[model samples]
Structure formats: structure tokens, C-alpha cells
Target: AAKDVVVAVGSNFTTLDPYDANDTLSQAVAKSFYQGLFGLDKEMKLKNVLAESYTVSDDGITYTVKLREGIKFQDGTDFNAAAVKANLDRASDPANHLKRHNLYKNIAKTEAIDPTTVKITLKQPFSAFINILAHPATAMISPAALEKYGKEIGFYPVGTGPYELDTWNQTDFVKVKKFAGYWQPGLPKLDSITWRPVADNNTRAAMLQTGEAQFAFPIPYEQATLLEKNKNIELMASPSIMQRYISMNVTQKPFDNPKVREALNYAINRPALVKVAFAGYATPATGVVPPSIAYAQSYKPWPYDPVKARELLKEAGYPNGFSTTLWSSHNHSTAQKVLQFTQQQLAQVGIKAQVTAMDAGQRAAEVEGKGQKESGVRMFYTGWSASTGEADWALSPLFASQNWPPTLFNTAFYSNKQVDDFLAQALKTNDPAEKTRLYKAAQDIIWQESPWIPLVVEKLVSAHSKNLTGFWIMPDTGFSFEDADLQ
Candidate 1:
């Protein structure tokens, strides 16, 4: 009764090792073929998948987890406590060169308590541990499989999930077969799946219209109207925790003044940009925390008064308005549109913004290593795909002072002692009540001191054929294909 399910993706699968590459496409595909100890629901609650249950110590510094018996990796290796230790150890190693090392940097150590029991010891009492474990990069792999395969494990990933890698033809196509031994019985209705990368949005839309691909990852805003007219396709969209915003290099000139930053943030109309760029698919963001967060409270945006913005600009010593270049990537069509809108908005205040589009690799190099000035970019638009639906993950990297000089996500170079202290306090406390209060306080502080312009929280748009069903989109923009079916 199994069927073949074909999916269309945007990026190419460069590495199977989740730690090595930050490719979103590769991570999404890897999730299907792997298993993490914990999973998260739409509300961000921790759910048991591989581990039956877990307990926290009285001090809240250590967590002990019990694994389910008879679970075997696709390579026939037994899944046990030792396997968990190996995966954690590899992730914690600095020499591993993992892209997501920051996620595990706080852990002191992980120990195998018994054949089926594993305990994680944290350096500090943190409630986000379980949520962090649900990240796709934290998926567990068999020790034997990893040892035998080495770096080649990415080429032939072996996990205890509902799908197994069958074949990969570089950027062209990737095929996966159903794993009969998956933990849940009568699952993975599809016998196999083929994930193809079609970069062109129009081509992806055409493929779905013609029934060549059963599912598509991203349907651009420009094609939303066209896809909505087709009766055979089902369109699903929700406000993602992801936020696309503009970051100014604080260490550079003209941006060091907080008034200048505030002027820029106040000049742009987020609602108008959402209408023009996202085609009404997004919600205007007032602060860094997206509406998807359970504890997030609604806040008002700084009024879009061009008069006030101009006054602030003059107060910051730029009386005639300034000229600067804005940088963005070509792959992000929506971001480009938003930047164009931003340029128009700034022009109202006598500011001139030149836009430049670059490739993903060059953009990463510019933001991560060579510093922002090398790209000849004064401002740039970027987004964060959050693993945890909490304000800490959303706000800390952009504004926290501790996570600097290679913290990876702190591209804005924003340094605020109060924000850093608030994040630190939130992390050390386990009380949900206190954590929410501290998070809100931090959000207010960051909004007042405008290092980045909060534009809008995006809505994830995907198209699927009627034959494919049961796959749900998570708040963090991930998909669990175990229950997905093709009829």
C-alpha cells in the first residue's frame, strides 16, 4: 500500500553532516532520515519520540533520559545510551567544525548512566535544554554507524526514522525509501520519496500544477495568486517564527549614534512593506519576538512619522540625510522586494540607499568572516530560522554582548550590557513566570535602542497535491514526514 512521494526543495544537499553545513534544505531532508531524543509540537511543548520519558534532578542541573528498547538504526546498530553520548560528544567537540556549535556550548558534559539511560549535566540550570534538543542538528546517530562511516556518513545517513536514503544525484534529485522498522507501526505510508531542487519559483509552481512533484517547499509571493487559482493544489500558510530585518554595523560611522538607528527604524512603514513585498502573507513585527512565541506580548511600533524621523536624523548630525548601500542576496526575492521598499521609505527623509545583490556563499563570507564593511554594505537584510520558539533564541544573538567575535548569529554587532544581563538572568532561572517577565523587559530595551529594523514575521507558504496528506508544519518551520502519505 506504499506509494512514492516527490518533494521539491530550493537548496542543494551539500553535506549530510548537520554540523558542517548550515544549508536549510540539507537539514530538512536530514530530519526525515534521522531521529532526535525529543520532538516539539506546534505549541513548542516537548514530546517523546526516541526517548520514552525523562526526569530532571532536584537541583535542575542534570537531566536523565530512558531510551526505548528494540529501536535499531537503519544500519542494524542497536540504539542505546552510548549512541546518545557519542552524538553529543561529537557535537560538543570544538574541532568538529559544526555550524551549530553555539547551541551546545553551555553543556558541561554528557554521561551514559546505563545501557538505556543517558544523563546530561549542564553548567547552569536552564529550562531551554529540552527545547534545544529538539533542534534538527541535535538528531542522534548510531555510534557504530558513525565510527565505520566517518565523514562519509552524510553520503549514506543511517538513522532510526521512518525514511532511509536511497540515492542522491547531487543537486538534481535525492531519493529515500520507507523504513519498515520505524518506531511507530503502520506509519510512513509512502514507499519512497524523491526530493528535487528547482530554484526557479515559476518552474516549481509549474511542476506542482502539472503534477510532476507532489509537494513544494517554498512558493514565492509573486506566484501566490497563481497557485491560489488552481483547484487541485492545497495551499497552507502560517506566521513563522522567522523574522527578516535590517542590521547596521554599530562599529561603523553614521550608525554609532542611536538616534540615527532609531530614525531609520521609524522611517520605514512595515505594513506597507508587507503588503508590497510579501503580498499580505506576513504580519508586521513590532519587536524581535514573533507572535509565534507563547509568552510574547503584543507591542506597538514606533510611529511611522517621517517628520519625527527627519528630526531624529538631524539630531544625530545628519541634517541633509545620508547615503548608504544596502546589501542582500539574489535567492531571497521577497527580501529584495522589501529592501526596495525600504529604499523608497528612506528616500522620503532625503536618504539614498543603493541596493546590491550577492550570492549565498559570498554573503555568508561577508557577514561571518571578513566583516560587514568589506561588502561595501552599510546595511543588510537577513533572517533567523529559530530552533526554539523562545525570545532568547530570537533576541540574544542580535543584541547580546557575550555572544560576540564568532558567535555566528550576532551579525549586527550590537552590544548592550543590560540586554546581555537580562538574557543571562533568563537562562539561569527555571521559573516560567520569571523568564517571561525578563524576556519582555529585554524586548522593550532592544526595541528602544534600534540596532536592527524589525520589518515583519514571515508566513511559510507551501503547495501540496491532494494525494499527499498528514504532514504538518511546525512553528519552527520544520516538517515531520513520518505520518505523510501519498495516495
Candidate 2:
């Protein structure tokens, strides 16, 4: 049946332009409209999409790309070398103030070798550059969209994907209709998909049960349990590195001592926290990046020993521990619960953490705002992901000194000269072994610094009506709805 399907997500998407979007809410929605040069299949392997094939120079600094022929953007502009050139130049243009402008620094320039062929030369080798392109941030938009909306096209996306925007009415819903011009025919089985930002866990789950929404995510485990029992709703879980952690301010007092910071890591029992706070819906985190990423370093988690914690506290000149504030936001209910659990865990070690919860928006501003040598909070209970399926994406955003807040999210205010140098050098090398060595060194430094105490790496859990088929959740926490069908 060619009918509309409704998907309930916890938040609404505000932007469709990939470069301007940073949140999962907006990027997931952008996927429906935009098509990147490369893509990931169900197995999470990198594969070609818009590009017919590609080759890299021996120096690993230049990429020659051959576009698939005869493709057209939703606005009917030809998808060619010129189109690719526009995307790269526009994103790299200093005037755009693109959120990912920092990343585009590697891309020296893009030239059209021919109508179907495009050549990209980078200032330095970035081994993960191809994988980075697979990200939605590089997803192509029509030249017309850039000209029409200029800086505001994030509110209006026009691309060459399986679906095109039909109507978007703020938080109400984003309605998309199937694009007959989609290069891949006989796909995007549903006639249309309407995305609604339900926000509440109970409301999203109830919508699935009531058939108001064909799919719902972050579906309450209780609702999933109930739905699984009934069989009318199908609960699904995907492997993810969706990490929740306490970001310690390494530049601050008490925590400024690595012993105190490392002590905090050992003080909390992650398995216990997962059991109580997440109801065992998550795996105890080993590090910031989950095992899913190929380049993720191998390092055992700091053993949970309150004894070591106390000794470290004493060693750091706090025999009985010191009082500190634990800042948190209320958006993710689990995060608040985790912080409450964290409060108890630290208190056992004689460290009193004054739990301060604020509205979601203010909390992010409050935390990320700590960009100075003297940071604000001692510890911030937060959630993040190494979602790009690459090591640099996992390490750079949080650990890189240059990618500090306002540019990226590095709330810990932690920096290491050695780690920064290694990350920079790795980006210029093509050898997989060397890249691994550099990134592993950086991860080891991060582990020792204890700026980020990873508590859990959660499974991506969601629920949908049983009749919904061909639905899949990507490791990066996005969905594959192009081939989705609902009976």
C-alpha cells in the first residue's frame, strides 16, 4: 500500500543541511533528503552510493571520484562533478560558518575533472577522509538550495535521495513523499513518511501501540517488555557506542590531580549503575569508543575498587575527599537517573557531589561553556557517541585540544601536548598500522587523564508495529527508512 508511515522520535529536527546539523535529531532526518558520495550498508561497511567508484593517490592526499551517471537532485539539477564541487566549496567556504568548517580545512580544493569525474586534493593525508565522507555531513544538496536559502537552507533541504520534503510544520511533523526520481528504483516502499517529535518516552511508545506511529525509538524498556509480550509490536536493538559518562574537569582543583581524577573512575561500579539506572539495557563501557569501531584501542577499564579510590583521595591530599558539584541536564531521563546514582557512588568515597539539574538547554550551555583554564563543574554527567564508525571521530571531538567547545564538545577542559601531536600526525598518514598506533596512544593518554569516566555503552533500543518491515537502526543511531514498509 502506498500510504504514509509515522515515526516518533524523542526530539524534533531543526535543520536539514548536514554541515549545520550536529545533533542526532536533525542529522537522522537529513538522511531522508540528502545523498552522500559513500554510504554504509546494513553490515556497517563502507560502500559507494552516488559515486560509481573512487581512487586515492599513493600519497593519500588526492581522491578521484566518478559519479554515477544520470542522477538528478530533487530540484532536478544534474548530479555531476559540478554538483560535488559546489558541496565541497560551499562547506569549506569561510563565509558559511559551517559547524564542520574545522574539518574541511583538510580539503584544499575540489576540481571537476569532467562532468562525471571530480578530484579532491587535501592539504594533508587523512586516512579516514573517505569514511568521513560517508557521514551525512557530506550529503549533497542541490545547487538551487544553496542559492535559494543561502545560510538558512538548513531549514530547507533539497537533495537526491529516496524521499523529498513535502511539508514541515515545526515541531508538529516533517512530512516527506517518495521521490520517483530516486536513482534506486523499487525502493522507499512506503508512499510517505511523517516524522513526529514526541519527546516523551511513554508518549512515543504509546503511539506505536496505538498505531499512531509505525515506529518509535528510545522506547521505554517497560513498554518494550509489554509490547514484546503482546507481539503486535516488535522491539529491536542494535549495537552502538552510545556512551554515558561523567566528564571530570581536569583543569580544576582536586580533579586537577590525575590521582583524584583516576580515583573517580574506580569509585563507581558501572555494571551496578547500568543495572539500576539503565535497567541492564546497556553494556558497561570499556572506553569512550565502543568495540564497534575498527580502530578503537584495546585498554582494560579501570578496576572498580572503592579501596583504591579512597587511597588515591588521601594521596591527592584529600583524606576524606572534598565537596564538588555534579552538573546535569534533564533532557535524557536516564542521564538524570545515572547522575543520581553517581551522587550515591561518590558519596560512599567521602566525596560529596552536589547534584544540580537544570533544564536541558541551559545545562548544555552551562557545561560546554566551561572552556577556560578554570572549569566550572568538577564532574558533569553527560552522554555522547563515537558514531562516525571511525577512530578520529571518536577521539578528536572530545580529546583534541583544538576542537574545544563552541567548535566541538570538549567539556572536560583537558589537554595533552603528546595526544594532540599524535592525532595531528595520524591524520596525515595512510598506513592503517600507524593510524592505529597514533589513535591508541591518544586513547591511552585519555584513559590515564581520566577526564572521561565512561559508565556505559548502551544498545540502541526501539519499537515499532509488527507490520513495519525493512526498518533498521544504524550503529551511529540513525535509521534506514528508505526501504521501510508498513502493512
Candidate 3:
């Protein structure tokens, strides 16, 4: 079709199922195929989409939403209160077991007042509930499709959105066609959109150069500067809310000792790592999470002190130091480079770490998402984002005792009852002062624990042909072709 367009990504999608859309690229694909009770705008503000409007009770534990009428899925299934229940229940159940589980964790149950009316009651007051629903991973999926595909839902998704998935090729590309029967009239202008994955940084950037790709993401600052020189191409950059770090599997050897964990934290020079690994485009992280929300305090990264780091390691019963493995994804060259840099940094402290690279998906499955008895990894380099635009979301899932992977992220498997309680309390109120106090306290405890060696906050780079218009770069580094138009 004349209106079709192509885009490129740094890595291919991990999966397409709404519940399984826990990774970056997959969320874009799911959003193209589905919508949620609410939609998130560029500034992370929530707007009524499927739900015409919603009202929260004074106690803040109950939400009653009014849904729009005359809306139906591409598969002709009526999108109503029943459909909403099925989707929520499926995501909540332990049987289906998805990464989006944390999103619905607070909801006790959903009651359908009628075909178009829904009331959700929570176990506790959660100020961030709407933010979770607006996230693509928690978006509405076709109830019929969930039943039909079961575990295979990632391969086959049907929803009420502007586009319909045409094909998903694992290694190459994902294609979506404009839904002829889309609920929104005369929008999603292009006849189709193809998301191509080119893992190599140089080759991904070159796509815009050669005109093989109309749009592409994760173009490094180094590449974006080069692409800016091209007249036909436009380079876009966003200070990403994504927090990058190295999660030391605490159940593993020396990392099980808190002194050793803090020693690892003191070992790395974050400033140099940001400059060398990210081409000077990343900010040194001050906390376990990205400081995105207003309540997030202005903080500082730990001072680099290899001598102090060595002393701590010696105190933790490794005076001569011990051997460990540094695991990272080949998918992200930035992480790959940091892994090597960190290996060098630790070596100076007498901790010899061998670097191992694997596909991003495999590393996530075997290393990040496992217990010590099951995991082969020692130190794993990775990143995470609250994406919901709240500090609680940033700290809770990754630091909470219940959200440890394969449930949520907390790949380091850091767990503390008091820390978990603080995060839980932080989400139970909308009071600004109390929330901030609780969150800051929780962060202090985490800083002392040192389960994570915080590194840098990213600024993502993207490139697209100047002919495309009406798209805005998001702070979370997510893609939205919804507003796009072309010459």
C-alpha cells in the first residue's frame, strides 16, 4: 500500500501477547493491536479511551468506570463489562502467570454493574492503578483470543485498536495493517506499519541512510550525530526514564554478603561508564529507580573507591578475592561494553570476573529470571523502568519481596520485609507528603542493602525520514505511531 511505512529497532520483540508484553519492542506491537481502559499521553497523563470516564471513591479503594458503547473487537466480539472482567481475571490468575501480574495485584475483584459499567475494588488504596492499566502490557486483550490461544496468545492477538497484526516474524520483522473496521475513524493514517529489527548499531542506523527504514530507534548519540548531517533524515532524542544497573544475584557466592554487594557498588566508576558505554548520553543514577516523579529526591551516585571496595571485599572473607561471571546481553552493545568495563573495574579489586554474552532473551530467561540453585549467572547487567510515571512503581516491583522474577523484575532477588512494607504503604495513599516520606525512607534502606549497583539513566536516540510527521518522542522511550502522518 502507498501509505505503508517501515521502522527499525535495536532488538526484536520478546513476545506480542498483552500480558507477555513485558519488554520494550513487544509493548509497541501490543499497543498497535490493543487498547486499554485508559490511554497514556506523551506526558504520561491518563485519558479516557474505552472508558468514557472513571470516578474513584472517597476512600480511594474503589473505582467505577463508564465504558463507551457500540465498540466491538475486530473479531466481532462485543467489548463490554464481561470482556473487561475476563481480561482482568486472566491477568490476575496465578495459572496464566504473567509479568503484568503486579499491575493487577492490588485489585481484589471487578464487578459489572451492567453491560457497560464496571466497578473495581482494590485490596488497598492504590494511586497508580490507572497508570498500570494505561501501560501496554496491561492493555485490553480479546477474551475470545485468550481462550483460543492459551499460552499461544503471544502468537495470535486480536483486539480493538487502529491496526490488526498481519504477521510476526521472530528474527526479522513484525507487520500490522490498518484495521478497516477500526473504532476511531480516519486515523492511523498509514495503510500498514512494519517494525524491522536490526541488532547491529551501525546497520540499524544505516537503514535510515539507505532509505530501507523510514523510522528507527536506539540510534546511539554517536550515530544520531552522524544521521543529523543527512538532509532527508531527522534525529530524535529523549532523556529516557529507563534505569540501568547490574543486579548481583544475592543468593550467589560473595554477593550473598551485604559488604561484598556494597563493595561491588563502590568499585565501578559510574561517570566513566556513562561516558564510554553510552557515549556521554546517560545520567548517573542516584537511586535504585529512575528519578522520574516529583517525589523522587535529588541524589548522587556513590563515589568510586576501588581501595574501599577492596577493603570491603576483604572484610567479607575474600581478601585475595574470588572469581565470578559477568553476564550481559549481546542485544545491547551498551550493556555489553559496560560488562567488560566492570570486569576491568572489579579486577583492580582482585575480583576476577569472566564476561559472557548471550542473546537478550536467553540471558533474561536463564540468568535474570531464576533462583540461585537454578541460575548460572553471578552479576547480570540490565535495565528497567517504572513506565507508569511513579516512584512507587519504580521501587516496588524491582525491590518488593513479592515481585522477584520470574514474577516481575527484581532479578537480584533482593528481599526485605520492612522495605516491602514501606513500598506497600507508599502506594496506599494519594497524600503527597506521606508518599514522599515513605518512598525516601524505602530508598535509604535499599541504598544500604546494595543489591543493585546502579549505573546510568539513558537518553534514547531515534531517527526517521523527515517525510513522517505528528509523532512525539516519549520519556520512557516507547513508540507510538498513533499520531503519525506523512507527506
Candidate 4:
């Protein structure tokens, strides 16, 4: 067990089923035992993994992919073109009701051309189609497992990654052992990895200090210096594409007014909030898309001017600020800090928000599970990363009108024909300049609309034992530790 590694993360991974899960932590943990046709490497660049090569037709609608042979799922099932089609078909089928179905709904057809080749036909050209395939959410699962486990597959994952799940003890730990039948030879360098959910930031830091955990991510930004002083630990402060924001339901009263939304944006002192909550480890967000993501355009963050916020509120017909509920999707220490600070800031502007922190289950039922007609929720505190490393993933899932709740994460229920058209047009074209032009236009509109009070782009703060190697915290907050080993 000398090569075994233990990781302490901030929260319990909600599910291992790639198609049904949404939280980034779930995706990170699942990557240990699941893989897609394509994958992002440690550098966060596109790489061929289960796939050999692929070619697109001149019309840009069809994709012919050559799959790698000699691969087997953890369940001893062969990974082939048919297997690829099985995963895609299930994910794209609306009746499946998978949380990530929206990501694949555009696939018009998937055909297993042969044992090694598969053909995919899209309804329209998507410039970031390959990036979509690379996304962790698109990971393949064994057809046998899919049939056997069904809706409970999240608990019993079967995939072709280098490791296989050994045990899951809920909040305590989920362990995976190296897959002895793995196709990639001499890889998955560690013998095993145990991921533990330590919600308290200080406890996670303590685990790293005591060598009980070899790695910890999103460690309290305040704990960085203390961890750095420990000789056995090394810290990684990589630039990240993670975004934090407050989403206001645009369909609800008060929030339905654009001026009210704009007022909320101008109400906060973003610099001070970042300092108070993140220990100055984040940059105040100016737009929905984090600047590090592809096609992200720069804009000035809304200045912190309480007077301007008050003026806007008055103009919006709310001479005196109204009452609302502000919900945080997480209940961790950092989340609490964020909520408490924002609550004080809003109170200063006469907005009496009843702050509440939701655990995973509450968040699932109350926020993500709500229907369009159910607008009981007001402002929601959440964060996201365009893990696909593109602007489309950043904007579409969280902003596009068609992506409203129950379908996707557009919790705001925001809509605008022009913004939607810009997003659609950007995907249709392959020209980089045209894509940039289209995306910038969309960002400008969304920024002016202010469906969200964009907060910060936090740095990826992670730490590992000095001896650990080949592990990285990707810019999008995804984990790249499949090949990690203790030196």
C-alpha cells in the first residue's frame, strides 16, 4: 500500500453517474473510474483517449470516429464503437431524463458503423463538438452496467478508466483500486486512491499536514500560508476558470424587472467581498464567462456604489428595498462565509435577504429540480466552471433561455431572443473571429441584462504531498490525477 494515496475534498461527491450528475466534485471523483472518447489532459487541452482519430464531413453535420481497440470496461465488457453508440443514444434520449441530457440533445443520430467505427450526425454544426466529447459528463459507461443498474448506476459505476471502484462509505470515503485489466500499460501509477469528504476547511488542511491525505483542493484560501510552511506539502495556485455568482430568478416578481437586477449588481463591493471570503485569492468577475475560458471578452466589473444601487432600486419602483431569500447551494465553511458577508452587504442597501445554506439534497430538490412555473426561490448562490474549456459551455447551460431548470442550470429563467441567437450562431460557425464576434455580442447583452450578480473568478487552490507527481488542478476546477504517483 506504499503507493496508495488519499484525497480530502471539501464536500461529498453527489453521484458517479456521469449522465445524471451536475456538481463538479462528482465529475472529479468519477474521473478516477470513468472516461469519455476524448479527454482533457493535465494542461487542459483536448486529447485522444478511448478514441483513435476522427474526421468530419464537409457539411459539418457528420462525425466519423475510430475507437481504440483492446480496451475493456471495469465490468470486463469490451469498449468498442457499439459501446460508444450505446452511451450517446442513452444520453441523448430525452426520456432518460439525465441531468446532462441537454449536453447531448443535439445528436440527431448515432450509428455503430462497425466494431471500430461509429458515426454521429448532429442537428447543426457545433464548433466545440469535440470539446463536448472531451467533457467528463460525456464519459462512457458499460452497456451491461447501464442495463443492470439503471437509475442507480450512480452508485455502481462501470467504466474503462485505469481505476475501478472498490468501496463507497458515503461521507466517510470512496475508494478505488488500480484496474489490473486496464488497457493503458504501466499507467494509473498509484496502487489505489481513497477520496474522503471533509467539509470543514481546517480538517482538510489538518489531514494534509498529518499526511493522512496526500492531496486537498479548494483548501481554505486562508490556510494556504500555513500549509506552505509545512515542508512536506506543496501548494498549487493555478489560474482557474471557476466562476462564483448570485443568480436571481428573472421570471419572479421584483427580479422580473431588469432595473432591479442591475441594482443588485451595483450593490456589492466585489473587491471587499473577495478579500473577506476568499482571502484575496480571487478576481472580481466582470462577466459571466471567466476570462481564462476560450472566447471570453473583458469588461469592467460593476463598481461598488451603494448610492447607484439605491438610485436604480428607486427607478425600478421599489423606493424601499423589498424582502427576498438568498440560498447557497453549499453549507461548507467557505459558503457560510460568502453568505454571511453578502447578507451584510445587501442589508446595507436596504435589501432584507433571509440567507439559507442548502445541503446537497436540499439543493437538488429545491433549486435544480424546480419547474419553470415554480418560482418560489429568489437569489441563489452558486458557482460553475466551463469545464469543457469553451465559452459555449459557460453561457449556454447557465444563461440560454432553452436551458431553464429541469432541463439545465439556467436557474434564473432568463430569456432574450438576441442573446439566444448569438449563442446559436456562435456554435454554427467554425471561424474563430466570427465565433469571437458572436460570443462578445452575447456577453454584452447578458452583462447589460444582469440576470446574475457576477462575483469572482477564484484561483484554483490545491495542495499535495511533496512526493506526489503528475497531479494538477485544471483551470476549470476539474482534477487530472489519473496517472499520479507518489515519488
Q: Residue 348 error for model 1, in Å?
A: 1.1
Q: Distance from true position, residue 414, model 2, in Å?
A: 3.3
The number of clashing residue pairs in each candidate reads: 0, 0, 0, 0
Q: Predict model 4's lDDT versus the native.
A: 0.87
Candidate number achieving the greatest lDDT relative to the actual structure: 4
Candidates in order, TM-scores: namely: 0.88, 0.89, 0.79, 0.81
User: TM-score rank, highest first?
Assistant: 2, 1, 4, 3
Model with the higher TM-score, candidate 2 or 3 = 2
By TM-score, is 2 or 4 better? 2
CA lDDT of 303 in candidate 3?
92
C-alpha-based local distance difference test score of model 1: 0.79
**lDDT value for model 3:** 0.81
lDDT, residue 104, model 2: 79
Show pairs that collide, candidate 2: none
Query: What's the lDDT for all of these models?
Result: 0.79, 0.82, 0.81, 0.87
**Model 2 stretches astray by more than 4 angstroms:** 42-44, 98-100, 148-156, 315-317, 330-332, 358-373, 401-409
Tens-digit lDDT track of model 2 for 49-106: 8999998988988999999999999888898899899999988888888887865778
Q: Write candidate 3's Cα lDDT for 1-487 as tens digits.
A: 3777888887878888867666757886677888889866666666788989888886889989899988888788888988898888878877777887877878899988998999998988887787777777776788888888878888878889888889888887889988888888888898888888887888889888998888888786667778999999988656778888888888778888889988888888989998888887788888776665435665666999999988998888888989988877776357667877889998988989988878768867886577646777678777777777778778877788787667777778889888899888877777778888988888888877888888888877788899888665567767766878777
Best by TM-score: 2
